[PDB]
Amino acid sequence: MREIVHIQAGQCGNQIGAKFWEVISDEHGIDPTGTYHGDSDLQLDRISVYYNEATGGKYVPRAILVDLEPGTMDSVRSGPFGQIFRPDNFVFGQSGAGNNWAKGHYTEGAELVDSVLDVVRKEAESCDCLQGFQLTHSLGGGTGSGMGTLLISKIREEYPDRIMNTFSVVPSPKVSDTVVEPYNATLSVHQLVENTDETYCIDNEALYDICFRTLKLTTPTYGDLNHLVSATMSGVTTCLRFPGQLNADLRKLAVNMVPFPRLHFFMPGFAPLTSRGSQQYRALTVPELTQQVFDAKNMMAACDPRHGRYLTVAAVFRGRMSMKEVDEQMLNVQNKNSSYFVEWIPNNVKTAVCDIPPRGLKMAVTFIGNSTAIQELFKRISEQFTAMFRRKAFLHWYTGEGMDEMEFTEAESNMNDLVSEYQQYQDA
Amino acid sequence: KEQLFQSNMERKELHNTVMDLRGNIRVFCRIRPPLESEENRMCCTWTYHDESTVELQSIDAQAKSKMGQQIFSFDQVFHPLSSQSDIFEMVSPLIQSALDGYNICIFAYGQTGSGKTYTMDGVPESVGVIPRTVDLLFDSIRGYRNLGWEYEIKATFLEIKNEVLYDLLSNEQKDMEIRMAKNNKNDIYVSNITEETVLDPNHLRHLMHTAKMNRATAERSSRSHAVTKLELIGRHAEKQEISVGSINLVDLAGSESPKTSTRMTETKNINRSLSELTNVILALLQKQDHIPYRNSKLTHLLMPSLGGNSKTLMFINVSPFQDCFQESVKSLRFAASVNSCKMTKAKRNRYLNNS
Amino acid sequence: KEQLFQSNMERKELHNTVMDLRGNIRVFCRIRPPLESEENRMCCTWTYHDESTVELQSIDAQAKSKMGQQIFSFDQVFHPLSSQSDIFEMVSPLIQSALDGYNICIFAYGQTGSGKTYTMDGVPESVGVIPRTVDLLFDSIRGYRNLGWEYEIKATFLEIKNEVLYDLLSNEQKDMEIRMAKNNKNDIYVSNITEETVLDPNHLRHLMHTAKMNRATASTAGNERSSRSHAVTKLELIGRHAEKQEISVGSINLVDLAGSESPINRSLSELTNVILALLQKQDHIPYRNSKLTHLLMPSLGGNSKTLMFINVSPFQDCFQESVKSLRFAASVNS
Amino acid sequence: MRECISIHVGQAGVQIGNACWELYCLEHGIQPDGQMPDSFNTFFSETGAGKHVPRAVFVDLEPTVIDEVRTGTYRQLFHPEQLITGKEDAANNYARGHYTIGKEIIDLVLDRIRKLADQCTGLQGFLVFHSFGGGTGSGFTSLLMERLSVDYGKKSKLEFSIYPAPQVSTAVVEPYNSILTTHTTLEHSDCAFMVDNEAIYDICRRNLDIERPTYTNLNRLISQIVSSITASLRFDGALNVDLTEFQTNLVPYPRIHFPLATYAPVISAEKAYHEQLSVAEITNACFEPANQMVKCDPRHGKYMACCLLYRGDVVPKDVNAAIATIKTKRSIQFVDWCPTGFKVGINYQPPTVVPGGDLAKVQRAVCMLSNTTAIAEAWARLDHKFDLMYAKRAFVHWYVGEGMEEGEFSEAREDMAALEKDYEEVGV
Ligand SMILES: Nc1nc2c(ncn2[C@@H]2O[C@H](COP(=O)(O)OP(=O)(O)OP(=O)(O)O)[C@@H](O)[C@H]2O)c(=O)[nH]1
Ligand SMILES: Nc1nc2c(ncn2[C@@H]2O[C@H](COP(=O)(O)OP(=O)(O)O)[C@@H](O)[C@H]2O)c(=O)[nH]1
Ligand SMILES: Nc1ncnc2c1ncn2[C@@H]1O[C@H](COP(=O)(O)OP(=O)(O)O)[C@@H](O)[C@H]1O
Ligand SMILES: Nc1ncnc2c1ncn2[C@@H]1O[C@H](COP(=O)(O)OP(=O)(O)O)[C@@H](O)[C@H]1O
Ligand code: ALF
Ligand SMILES: [Mg+2]
Ligand SMILES: [Mg+2]
C-alpha cells in the first residue's frame, strides 16, 4: 500500500529520525514496546506505510539505521523507542568516516554499503508497493553525507521509478561547526542534484533564533530543533498516510513543485509556533496561523524571502480548515508579496487539507515553498569553497584517500549553475 | 560540348561547396521508396518543387482541411529513386572536412521503418554511409601519407538507453560517465570506454560486424541511441604539427508518438531526448543567453557537436505514407526549425610540437 | 539567353544578400616577398597559424620575450607565394555588387613600401586590382547588353594630400568642393572634377596613365608628395534597362591610402575611426571631420561594402609599424 | 424499464455519486440496506432478496475514497463487486489516467459495466461523475467515454463533470488536464454538463446564506440537480421528457454541447417564511445572472437552450404565462432560428431535501440547464491559461513522460479555437 522506506545517516540524522519515530508513534498511539494501544483505529489501519506489523500487534518501524560510529545506535538502544526497532536494522560499521566525505564514500562506508543495501532491499521486497526514499541525514559530517551519497546512487541505479526525498540539513551561514563542511556539502549536493529530486535548507541558527524568540526558549537544545524537524516531516506525509477531504501524497509534492528537473530544492515551513504559555496574548485560529506561516519570521533557512521569490507553494493544512479563507489569504499574499513572487508562474498553490490534526493541536499547516532565495546560500557556500580552494585548505585529508580536485571543480561549477538557474528564474 | 560538361561539373561542385560551407546544419530530407505493403495499406501524395524542396500535400479531406500545402525548402531533398551514392556525394566533402581537423556529427531523424539504418549501416543489401565513409577516409589517409601526414584512428562505441550507458563493444556491465577533458573545457569524453586503435579497414569491418551483432542482440534497435566516436590525429614529422578531428555517428531513436505499441521507460527516454533537443534548439534560435545543456545525457555528450566547434548534419528520414502524416509533418517542422538554426564557426586546430 | 541572364540576375541578388549577411567589411593581409635588393635585410619570424590568422615575431631574443603575444586573425591571409589572382578573387563579388547598384570601397593599408601601390596599381608584368576590375567590369557590361541593360562608366581621378583635393586628369588647377548630391542628400558629388566617360579598357588605361603622370609621384623621390597622399579612383556605374526602366547606379571606389608610418595622418586616423564606428554600429559617425571621409558618404553606408588590405613588410626594421597595422586590423576582427 | 446507469470516478466523482445515491435512497424510501419498508427500477436492480442494488459503479485509481465509502453507511447499499479500486492516484495527470494505468483497469470496469448492461432491460445512457483539472477525472474518464462510444455510441453518454474555476485553482496543472480531456471528449460526448466552484460559493453565500460550507453542501446541490434531472425517468409528470430527447433538444449543433446547471429555490430555512414560493418568482430567480453554477455573465451571451425542470404541485398555465413574460424581457437574449426555446420539464413529484441538509422543504423546485454563448469567455480564458503555461514548456516533462506529445497539445488548442469560432458564429 504505497509504502515508504526510512533511512538514517550521521548523528544528526539518527537523532532526528529517533524523535521523528517517537512523534509518529504518538500520532498512531503506539507504545514504545511496539504494541498498539491508541484508540483511533484509523491510524492503526493505515499504519502499514510506516509500521510493518510483525507479530501480535508488535509493529517494527520500517527503519534503516546506518552509521560508522557505534555510539549513536548505542544511545538509541539505551534511549526509549530504540528497542522498538527490529535489531537486525542497526547496520553500522566500527571505524568511522571522521567527518571525511571521501572516507564516507570509499572507505568503511564503501563496504558497509552492501551490508545495509541487502537489508534495505529485503525490506523493500517485503513491502507491497513503494513510493520513495527519505534519507534522514545531515550534510554536516562526512559520514552521513558520504555514505548517503553512495546509497542514493545505488538506490537510483536500482530503482528509477521511486521518488526519494532527502531532508538535508544545510550548513549554517555563520555558526559553522566543521572546518571542511563546505567541501563535504558541495561534493554531496553534486551527486544529489545529479540524482535527487527534493532537498531542504535547514539552518541550526535559524531554528536557534526561532525557538529563542518565536518560541521564547532559553536553551535551544538539539532536542527542540529535531522535534521541529520531526513535526515538519510528519506533516509532509500526513496527507498520504491519513484520509482527508482533499488528499495528497509524496507524488503530488513530487510532480507539482518542479517546473524543471534540476530545480528541485525546497524550503519547508510549519505553523502554529505558539510559545510555552502564549495562549492568552492571542486566540488560536487559522487566519492568524496562515498570517504567521508565510512570513520570513517563520521560514526554515537563512535564505531570507526578502531576496527571493516563492516559485511555488504547497501548503497542506493538516487538520480541519476552510478553503475559502486560505484562497483569500493566498490571493492577498500574492498581492502584497508579488515582488517576492514569481510573476511568470501564476496560480501557484497546493491546498491539500488532510482531516486529522496533530495531537493536542486543533489546527496545523506545513508550508512547502520553492523560494528562489537558496541561490544566496549556494553563493556563500561556493565562496567558502573557492576561499578554501585557493590554498586547497586542508585538502590533504581528501586527496590522500585516492581523490582528485577534478570532482571538486565540477561540483563548484554545478553549484554555480544552480545559482544561475535560481537567479535566471527569479528575475525572469 | 566538353566546355558545357566542364561548366556543369564545376557548377555542381560549387553548389556542393556552398551548401556544405553553409553555416550550422545541412538539413537533408530523404524520402525512401515507399514499401508496397504500406503503399497498398495507405499512402499520401508528395511533390518536389525542386531538388531541395518537398511538399507533402497528401490531398486528404480532414488532414487537408487541417494541413494543406506542406511545402518546406531544405538544403537537399532526395527522391525515392535516389541511390546511396546520391546521399554519400555531399557527405564526402563532410568527411574531407572532418579529416582536415574538424569535429563532425551526423544525425538521422526518423521513425520505425524510416530507413535510418539504411543510411548509416545500409541494410544487408547494398552499403551505407558508414562503410563508404570509412573507405573514403582511408583513401584520403593514404593520399595524405603521400603528402607526409601520419594519421591514427581511434574508435569508441557507446549506446544510450533509459539513462543507462551501455558499451556496444564490451558485454560487461560498467558504470559509464561522460566528462570534459582536462586539457580543454570544450572537448568531452567518456570514462571507462572500450577504446581500440584501428589497424586496417579489415579490423574496422570486423569490429563493425561484432558491434552490430551485439546491437541486434541488444525491436530495441528501433528505439535506441548509439553513439560512434571516431577520433583522428594527424602528425607531420617534417612540420611537427598535429591535426585533431572527430567523427560522431549518432542514430536517434524512433520519433513516433507513444500510441499503444510502446513500453514506458523507452518511450520516456525517447521523449527526454526529443524534448531536450527541441528545447535547446529553440533556445539557440531565441539567442538565449544560457542554454540548459546539462539536463539530458544526449546533449551533454554532444556538447562539441551541439555547442562547440563542430559541423552537424540532419538526415530527415520520413515515411511517405499518410498513416504517419502527423509525425511526418511534425518531423518536417523540426527539420525546418533546425535548418533555421546557426552554429559556432568551424575552427581548425593545429598543434605545433616545437616545445 | 534571356533565361540565362535572368538566372544570373537572381544569383547576383542572392550574392549581394549573402555578402550583406556575412558582414561586408572584410580585412585581408598580404606580405610582399623580399626583393633582390633586400636580401641582406633582417626579416621577421612569421608563423602562419591558419589562412585567416598569422603571428609576427622579432628576431631579437631580448625583445621577443618582452612583447607577449602578437597573434592577429583576419578574414584571409595572403602569403608571398600568393599571386594577384588570389587577391582579386575576393574583389570580383564586390565588383558584381557594384554592378547591382551597391557602393564598393577598396582600401590598401600599410606603411611606405608595404606594397599598397602594387596591391592596387601593380606592375605591367602582374596587373593589380584596377586592371582586372576594369576587364571584369567591361565583360560584365557586355553580358548585361543581352538583357537590355545599358551600362555607362564615369571615372573620376582625384588625390588628397593635406585635406585639399586635386584633379589628376587636368593641369588646370581649380578649387573643388565636396557637396551633397542634387537628387540625393545621402549621395555626394564634387564640383569642377573632370568626369570622363569610359568607352573601352584602352580609354581607361590611358586615363589612369595620364592621372599617374599628372600626379607627379614622389614616394621614393624625397618621400614628400606621393608617400603622404591618397590616390582615390572612382568608377561610377549607370545601369539602364530599356522597356522596363528601374535603373540602378553603383560606384567602385578604388582608394590607395597614404603611408601609415609615423612622421598626413589627419585623413587616415579619421578613416580608421569611421571604420571602427561602423563596426560598432554607432548612431553618429564622424564623417565630416576629414575630406577623405567626407568624400565617401554613399560608399560607407549600411548597404555599402568595404574592403581593406593590410600590407606589411616582412622586415625587422618594419616591425614597429607592422605591429601597429596588425593592431588596427585586430581592432576590426574583434 | 428505461433503466440507466452511472459511474463515479475521482474524488469529485465518488463524493458527488455518494450524494446522488443517498438522495435517491431517501426519495425512494430506500434504507441504507437497500429495501423499501416500478418507479425505482430504472436505477436499482432488485435482487432475489428484499434488496435493490444501485446501478452504479465507483471506480478510482486510489483506494482511499472507495475505502471510506466502504466504511460509510452505504456499504450495504452497494454490492462490493462494483467498488473497483486502483492503487495510486493519477498524480493529477491526464497522461497517467489515459495511457499508463488506465489500460490496466479499463478492461475490468468495461466487463463490470457490460455485466450491468446485460442486467439492464432497456438501456438509456451513462452518468459519469468526475473532474476536469483532476488527473483521473480527465485521463481515465476520456478513456472510458471513448471506449463506451466504441461499445455503444447510440446510448446517451451524459457526462456530468466539474468545470474548473477561473480564479481559485486547487491544483496547478488544470489547463493541461482540461484541454486534453476536452480534446478527447468533444467528438464523443452527447452533452457534458458544467459546474463551477466559485458560483456554488456565491450561491451558498448570498442565497443559502451559509458562511462555512463543506464539499458536502456542494454535492448536496449537485445531487438535487441530478435528482430533478432524472425525476422524469423516476416519476410521472404532467409533461415527462427523458434524456433521449435532450440531445436534439439542447444542442443546436453536434459539437456545442456544454450546458451549465442552475438550481432554484436556493434559499435556506429562514427565507421559507419570508417567501410564499410562487412559480413565477422562482422562474425569474433561476434566470437571474447571479444564480447560475458557472462564473459567466448570462446577459452577455445569446442563449441557445434553456431546459427548465420543475417539480411539485405546479400547473402548466402559470408556467406558460411566466415563461412568456420572461420571453418579453429585454436583457434575456436568444439566437434567431430558435425563438421558441423554452422546453419545460414540468413534473408533479415534489423534491425532498435530505435530513440534516441545508435547503428547506419547498413545495416546488426548478432547475434550468442553460446553454449559452456566455461560457465561451470562460473557455477562452482557460485556453489562455493553458497557452501561457505551455509557452515556456513548464511542467511538460511529466506528461511527455507518461505518453503525450506537444503536437496533439497544439491540435487540442486549435480544436479549442475552432470551438470558440463555432461559439461566436452561433452567437451571430
Ligand atoms: N465540488 C467538489 N469538488 C471536488 C471534490 N473533491 C475533489 N474535487 C475537485 O477535484 C479536483 C481535482 O481532481 P480530483 O478528483 O481531486 O483528482 P482525481 O480526478 O482523482 O485525479 P488526481 O488529480 O490525480 O487526484 C480539485 O480541483 C477539486 O476541486 C468534492 O468533494 N466536491
Ligand atoms: N536538526 C538537527 N541537526 C543536528 C543535530 N545534531 C547535529 N546536527 C547537525 O547535523 C550535522 C551532523 O554531522 P554528521 O553528518 O552527523 O557527522 P558524521 O556522521 O560524523 O559525518 C552537524 O553539522 C549539525 O549541524 C540535531 O540534533 N538536530
Ligand atoms: N531506399 C530504400 N530502399 C530499399 N529499402 C528501404 C529503403 N529505405 C528503407 N527501406 C526499408 O525500410 C526498412 C526499415 O528498416 P530499418 O532501417 O532497420 O529501421 P528504421 O527505418 O526504423 O531505422 C528496411 O527493412 C528496408 O527494407
Ligand atoms: N615583385 C617585384 N619584383 C621586382 N621589382 C619590384 C617588385 N615590386 C616592386 N618592385 C620595384 O619597386 C618599384 C615600385 O615601387 P613601389 O614599392 O611600388 O612604390 P610604393 O612604395 O609607393 O609602393 C618598381 O620600380 C619595381 O622595380
Ligand atoms: F527500426 Al530502426 F532504428 F528505426 F531499427
Ligand atoms: Mg535502426
Ligand atoms: Mg607609389
Query: Any idea which ligand is nearest the CA of A96?
Result: 2
How far, in Å, CA of D260 to CA of D203, rounded?
Answer: 15
D169 touches chain A (CB under 8 A): yes
Which structural domain, as residue segments, surrounds residue A337?
A: 260-373
Contact between B233 and B151 (Cβ < 8 Å): yes
A402 touches chain B (CB under 8 A): no
How far, in Å, CA of B260 to CA of B264, rounded?
Answer: 10
**What HEC string does B255-295 produce?**
CCCCCCCCCHHHHHHHHHHHHHHHHHHHHHHCCCCCCCCCC
Q: What is the largest CA-CA distance in chain D?
A: 62
Which chains, if any, share at least 3 CB pairs under 8 A with chain C?
B
- Measured in residues, chain B has a length of 355
Strand, helix or coil for residue B92: helix
How far, in Å, CA of A120 to CA of C299, rounded?
Answer: 78
How far, in Å, CA of A414 to CA of A353, rounded?
Answer: 37
* B250: Cβ contacts below 8 Å, ≥ 6 apart: B105, B106, B107, B108, B225, B226, B227, B228, B302, B305
Strands B350-352 and B188-191: unpaired
Exposure string of C159-173, with b = 16+ CB inside 10 Å and e = fewer, is bbbeeebbbbbeeee
| Cα–Cα nearest to A205, from A169, A175, A167, A170 | A175
Chain C interface mutation, best of B342, B350, B353, B355, highest count of C Cβ atoms under 10 Å: B350
DSSP label at D157?
Answer: E
Contact between D98 and D403 (Cβ < 8 Å): yes
Domains D1-259 and D375-428 share a fold: no
| Domain spanning B2-342, CATH architecture | 3-Layer(aba) Sandwich (3.40)
For chain A, the domain total comes to: 3
The beta strand positions in D63-116, using DSSP E, are: 84-85
Contact between D237 and D364 (Cβ < 8 Å): no
| Cα–Cα nearest to B141, from B184, B204, B183 | B204
How many CA atoms does the CB half-sphere of D227 hold within 13 Å? 29
- Measured in residues, chain A has a length of 428
Residues on chain A touching D214 (C-beta within 8 angstroms): 245
Distance set, CA A125 to CA A89, A118, D239 (Å): 15, 11, 63
Chains A and C touch (3+ CB pairs under 8 A): no
How far, in Å, CA of A27 to CA of A47, rounded?
Answer: 10
* B75: Cβ contacts below 8 Å, ≥ 6 apart: B19, B22, B26, B27, B28, B52, B339
Minimum-distance CB partner of D88 among A251, A331, A351: A251
Query: Burial of A17 by CB count in 10 Å (0-12 exposed, 13-18 middle, 19+ buried)?
Result: buried
What's the CA dihedral at A280, A282, A286, A289 to 10 degrees? Answer: -120
Q: Look at residues A259, A286, A313 and tell me which one is the last residue of a structural domain.
A: A259
* Grid cell of C253 as nine digits: 571606389
Whether D170 sits inside 8 A of A351 (CB atoms) is yes
How far, in Å, CA of A188 to CA of A147, rounded?
Answer: 10
Whether A261 sits inside 8 A of B295 (CB atoms) is yes
Contact between A285 and A322 (Cβ < 8 Å): no
- Compute φ and ψ for B154, nearest 5 degrees: -115, 130
DSSP secondary structure string for all residues of C120-145:
HTB-SSSB-HHHHHHHHHHHHHHHHG
**Torsion-angle region of B115 (φ positive above 0: left; ψ -120 to 50: alpha; else: beta):** left
Distance set, CA A134 to CA A62, A164, A370, B236, D412 (Å): 11, 6, 19, 59, 39
Separation of A12 CA from ligand 2 center, angstroms? 4
DSSP label at D418?
Answer: H
Whether D403 sits inside 8 A of B326 (CB atoms) is no
Report residues whose beta carbon is within 6 angstroms of any ligand 2 atom: A 10-13, 15-16, 97, 99, 138, 140-145, 169, 177-178, 204, 222, 225-226, 229
Does A272 sit behind a cis peptide bond, omega within 30 degrees of 0 on the bond before it? yes
| Cα–Cα nearest to D394, from A347, A335, B334 | A347
How many CA atoms does the CB half-sphere of A383 hold within 13 Å? 8
- Compute φ and ψ for B258, nearest 5 degrees: -55, -40
- Counted across chains B and D, CB pairs separated by less than 8 A come out at 27
Residue A142, domain CATH = 3.40.50.1440
Separation of B60 CA from ligand 3 center, angstroms? 26
Q: Give the domain ranges of chain B.
A: 2-342
CB of residue B254 inside a 6 A radius of ligand 5: yes
Number of Cβ atoms within 10 Å of the Cβ of D368: 25
D245 is catalytic: yes
How many CA atoms does the CB half-sphere of A54 hold within 13 Å? 12
**To test ligand 4's pocket by mutation, which of C84, C112, C118 has the most ligand atoms within 8 angstroms of CB?**
C118
Separation of A37 CA from ligand 1 center, angstroms? 34
The single-letter code of the amino acid at A417 is D
How far, in Å, CA of D229 to CA of D243, rounded?
Answer: 9
Strand, helix or coil for residue B55: strand
Please indicate, yes or no, whether residues A24 and A74 belong to a single structural domain of this protein.
Answer: yes
**To test ligand 2's pocket by mutation, which of A69, A105, A138 has the most ligand atoms within 8 angstroms of CB?**
A138
Which class would CATH give C2-333? alpha beta
How far, in Å, CA of C218 to CA of C229, rounded?
Answer: 10
* Grid cell of A233 as nine digits: 516531516
Strand, helix or coil for residue C251: strand
What's the CA dihedral at C173, C175, C181, C187 to 10 degrees? Answer: 80
| Cα–Cα nearest to D172, from B275, A237, A258, A232 | A258
Rg of chain D on CA atoms, in Å: 21
B275 touches chain D (CB under 8 A): yes
The CATH number of the structural domain formed by D1-259 is 3.40.50.1440
Which of ligand 2's atoms lies nearest the C-alpha of A98? Answer: 20
How far, in Å, CA of B282 to CA of D180, rounded?
Answer: 24
* Grid cell of A128 as nine digits: 507491497
* C111: Cβ contacts below 8 Å, ≥ 6 apart: C259, C260, C261, C312, C313, C318, C321, C322, C325
How far, in Å, CA of C298 to CA of C302, rounded?
Answer: 9
Please pick, among D146, D245, D408, D420, the residue that the annotation labels catalytic: D245
Sheet containing strand A199-200, strands side by side: A199-200, A265-271, A365-371, A310-313
The reply to whether D403 sits in an annotated binding site is: no
- Compute φ and ψ for D77, nearest 5 degrees: -65, -40
| H helix or E strand, kind and range, residue D52 | strand D52-54
Whether D64 sits inside 8 A of A243 (CB atoms) is yes
Strand, helix or coil for residue D56: strand
Which of ligand 3's atoms lies nearest the C-alpha of B222? Answer: 22
Contact between D175 and D386 (Cβ < 8 Å): yes
Residues on chain D touching B327 (C-beta within 8 angstroms): 407
Report residues whose beta carbon is within 6 angstroms of any ligand 4 atom: C 35, 112-113, 115-118, 219
Of all protein residues, the one whose alpha carbon is nearest to atom 5 of ligand 5 is B222
DSSP label at C43?
Answer: B
Which of ligand 4's atoms lies nearest the C-alpha of C126? Answer: 1
B163 touches chain A (CB under 8 A): yes
Fold category of D260-374 in CATH: 60s Ribosomal Protein L30; Chain: A; (3.30.1330)
B258 touches chain D (CB under 8 A): yes
Task: Say yes or no: domain D375-428 is CATH 3.90.78.10.
Answer: no
Sign, CA dihedral C94-C99-C102-C103, equals positive
How many CA atoms does the CB half-sphere of D386 hold within 13 Å? 25
Whether B295 sits inside 8 A of A262 (CB atoms) is yes
- Compute φ and ψ for D244, nearest 5 degrees: -65, -40
Sheet containing strand B53-55, strands side by side: B47-50, B53-55, B71-73
Does A261 sit behind a cis peptide bond, omega within 30 degrees of 0 on the bond before it? no
Exposure string of D153-192, with b = 16+ CB inside 10 Å and e = fewer, is eebbbbbbbbbbbbebbbbbbbbbbbbbbbbbbbebbbbb
The reply to whether D62 sits in an annotated binding site is: yes
* Grid cell of C233 as nine digits: 579612383
Q: C196 pairs with which residues across the strands?
A: C155
Strand, helix or coil for residue B111: coil
Comparing alpha-carbon positions, the chain A residue that sits nearest to B297 is A194
- Angle, helices B91-99/B129-146, rounded to nearest 10 degrees: 50
Please indicate, yes or no, whether residues A153 and A226 belong to a single structural domain of this protein.
Answer: yes
Query: Closest approach of chain C CAs to the CA of B344, in angstroms?
Result: 14
Q: Give the domain ranges of chain D.
A: 1-259, 260-374, 375-428
Alpha carbon D230 to its chain centroid, in Å, reads: 12
The single-letter code of the amino acid at A378 is F
- Compute φ and ψ for A270, nearest 5 degrees: -140, 155
Number of Cβ atoms within 10 Å of the Cβ of A74: 14
* D167: Cβ contacts below 8 Å, ≥ 6 apart: A331, D198
How far, in Å, CA of C138 to CA of C152, rounded?
Answer: 10
Minimum-distance CB partner of D172 among A247, A324, A348: A348
Whether A345 sits inside 8 A of D394 (CB atoms) is yes
Please indicate, yes or no, whether residues A190 and A247 belong to a single structural domain of this protein.
Answer: yes
Strand, helix or coil for residue B137: helix
Residues on chain A touching D201 (C-beta within 8 angstroms): 324
Distance set, CA B252 to CA A262, B266, B333, B338, D324 (Å): 24, 13, 17, 15, 68
Contact between C210 and C169 (Cβ < 8 Å): yes
A245 touches chain D (CB under 8 A): yes
Comparing alpha-carbon positions, the chain B residue that sits nearest to C21 is B23
Contact between C27 and C275 (Cβ < 8 Å): no
How far, in Å, CA of D135 to CA of A63, rounded?
Answer: 32
CB of residue B32 inside a 6 A radius of ligand 3: yes
Separation of C160 CA from ligand 7 center, angstroms? 14
Please indicate, yes or no, whether residues A195 and A279 belong to a single structural domain of this protein.
Answer: no
* CA angle, residues A299, A300, A303, in degrees to nearest 5: 80
How far, in Å, CA of B123 to CA of B126, rounded?
Answer: 7
- Hunting for cell 507504545 — which residue is that? A31
* A342: Cβ contacts below 8 Å, ≥ 6 apart: A309, A310, A311, A312, A348, A372, A425, A426
**What HEC string does chain A produce?**
CCEEEEEECHHHHHHHHHHHHHHHHHHCCECCCCEECCCCHHHHHHHHHCEEEEECCEEEECEEEEECCHHHHHHHHHCCCCCCCCHHHEEECCCCCCCCHHHHHHCCHHHHHHHHHHHHHHHHHHCCCEEEEEEECCCCCCHHHHHHHHHHHHHHHHCCCCCCCCCCCCCCCCCCCCCCHHHHHHHHHHHHHHHCCCEECCCHHHHHHHHHHHCCCCCCCHHHHHHHHHHHHHHHHHHHHCCCCCCCCHHHHHHCCCCCCCCCEEEEEEECCCCCCCCCCCCCCHHHHHHHHCCHHHCCCCCCHHHCCEEEECCCCEECCCHHHHHHHHHHHHHHCCCCECCCCCCCCCCCCECCCCCCCCECEEEEEEECCHHHHHHHHHHHHHHHHHCCCCCHHHHCCCCCHHHHHHHHHHHHHHHHHHHHHHHC
Distance set, CA A12 to CA A120, B13, C228, D409 (Å): 20, 72, 83, 47
Number of Cβ atoms within 10 Å of the Cβ of B136: 17
Number of Cβ atoms within 10 Å of the Cβ of D73: 12
Of all protein residues, the one whose alpha carbon is nearest to atom 10 of ligand 4 is C35
How far, in Å, CA of A389 to CA of D227, rounded?
Answer: 74
Separation of B127 CA from ligand 3 center, angstroms? 12
The reply to whether D13 sits in an annotated binding site is: no
Contact between D18 and D223 (Cβ < 8 Å): no
